[PDB]
Amino acid sequence: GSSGSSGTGQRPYECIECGKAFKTKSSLICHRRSHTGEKPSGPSSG
Numbered sequence: 001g002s003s004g005s006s007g008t009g010q011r012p013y014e015c016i017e018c019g020k021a022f023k024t025k026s027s028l029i030c031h032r033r034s035h036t037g038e039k040p041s042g043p044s045s046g
């Protein structure tokens, strides 16, 4: 167990890369992908 916590969640699409909320996925996708680009990444799994 840990100190009292909460569980945010207003929209069905919430980005975890930065922390943004979108109405539809189409937007969440076109956004998330953006994050990735000119930067060193590691082994992708999914």
Ligand SMILES: [Zn+2]
Pocket (backbone or CB within 6 Å): 015, 016, 017, 018, 019, 020, 031, 032, 035
């Ligand atoms: Zn983001």
